[PDB]
Structure 1
Amino acid sequence: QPRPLLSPPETEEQLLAQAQQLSGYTLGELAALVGLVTPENLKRDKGWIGVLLEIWLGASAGFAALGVELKTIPVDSLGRPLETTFVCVAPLTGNSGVTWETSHVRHKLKRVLWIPVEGERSIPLAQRRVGSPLLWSPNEEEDRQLREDWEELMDMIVLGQVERITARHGEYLQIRPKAKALTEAIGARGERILTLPRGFYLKKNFTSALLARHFLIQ
């Protein structure tokens, strides 16, 4: 029977052991154990699940230390990703001299704690359960492909071909509009263009394969 961490995890094994303690419990049960009330619609408190997990993952403090990025991931009653996963915002101006090494994507992705949560809309927020957590780092072959995708997409962005981008660019990573708003960028001629703000995303089949791995034998 779970209890929130009296202090932040001092190691990633401590952080994972706790995350695993919340598997099977619903957001409503986890909030009731901490004196919180689950909204009836997340749209009113857009960042509610994040605060709750942070309270449980140790000290609200009224993971940057451990070097592990926490990422919730919406899944179905079977634990498979419902959608595309957002990594970070893709800036269309002022990203020169930036590399894969000093990129926020690689940073945020170097070591991740995936926390599956049933994200199916029709399910009352309070009845959505936490799945099985998974600490993950891209292997050398995945990290080369992530670099290939990041360099390609940033190349297009800076070369003035952001509108030329589709889901066909990048095997793992993807750039999709972050969704009214328009952000400034560079065109095919180098001219100024207004466009939909963008973000780096990970394909569904990618987060899908990684959560499913440990199940397979032979």
Structure 2
Amino acid sequence: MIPQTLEQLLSQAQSIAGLTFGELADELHIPVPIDLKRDKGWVGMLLERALGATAGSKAEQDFSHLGVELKTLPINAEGYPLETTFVSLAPLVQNSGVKWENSHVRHKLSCVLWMPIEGSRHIPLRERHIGAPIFWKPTAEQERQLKQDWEELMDLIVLGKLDQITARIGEVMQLRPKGANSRAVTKGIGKNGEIIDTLPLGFYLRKEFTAQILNAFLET
């Protein structure tokens, strides 16, 4: 079930490539919803089960004994990312003199097993296909880009400049809301340093960034 080897995980990943959500859900005796409107994480959770990841786990990475993070990536009919990719929650407090090297973002993006999946709305959920895995490590350039955005976004957060934060900041990674709705709150830092109530935020990779990953892969 849970792969004990990196070779095991990749082979298990190679083997589900080409399957439709219906076929895989069938094997795992997992019911398939009509669509993702009220099961937004169903596909990500489907792949976790098929690959041996623990459901609901809060570990730094899906496979801590391998140092591998698993992420599904919805792609459109032309091979382009359909959505941005959620990475992790931005620490709004207890962010003192935090460095990039020890960041959650870095930890989660150091080694990613990308599982591209069809996301086109015109295709019935049951029939969407699972693509071929892409075992990824950020290039020296990609990591410099991520680090730069992380530092810029974090400076904004640590300085209580949350009001100035928009999704438009960041070259390849951005901050957008991450919660139940626009009324969700978590502790943050105000304009004077007081601990305030604020909208929880998460780091997201932009579509251009993941599109670059898919492109480099195709070029191989």
TM-score, normalised via structure 1 length = 0.85
For the residues of structure 2 that align with 1:124 and 1:147, how far apart are their CA atoms?
Answer: 38
TM alignment of 1:58-137, pairs within 5 A: 58=52, 63-137=63-137
CA RMSD of aligned residues (A): 2.5
| Structure 1 equivalent of residue 188 of structure 2 | 185
- Displaced runs of 4+ in structure 1, greater than 6 A? none
For the residues of structure 2 that align with 1:116 and 1:209, how far apart are their CA atoms?
Answer: 13
TM alignment of 1:198-209, pairs within 5 A: 198-209=201-212
For the residues of structure 2 that align with 1:102 and 1:60, how far apart are their CA atoms?
Answer: 23
Query: Which amino acid in 2 is paired with 1:203?
Result: R
For the residues of structure 2 that align with 1:175 and 1:46, how far apart are their CA atoms?
Answer: 19
TM alignment of 1:155-166, pairs within 5 A: 155-166=155-166
The CA deviation at 1:125 is 1.8
Structure 1, 52-61 or 153-162: larger mean CA deviation: 52-61
SS at match of 2:176: strand
For the residues of structure 1 that align with 2:211 and 2:23, how far apart are their CA atoms?
Answer: 27
Query: Which amino acid in 2 is paired with 1:27?
Result: F
CA contact (8 A) 1:23 1:131 kept: yes
- Asked if 1:215 corresponds to 2:218, the answer is yes
Q: Which runs of 5+ in 1 are unaligned?
A: 1-6
Larger Rg: 1
The CA deviation at 1:68 is 0.6
The CA deviation at 1:105 is 0.6
Distance 1:96 1:122, change over 3 A: farther
> In the comparison of the two structures, how many residue pairs are matched?
211
| Structure 1 equivalent of residue 44 of structure 2 | 50
SS at match of 1:42: coil
Structure 1, 96-105 or 186-195: larger mean CA deviation: 186-195
Q: Which runs of 5+ in 2 are unaligned?
A: 56-62
Percent identity reads: 58
Structure 1, 173-182 or 110-119: larger mean CA deviation: 173-182
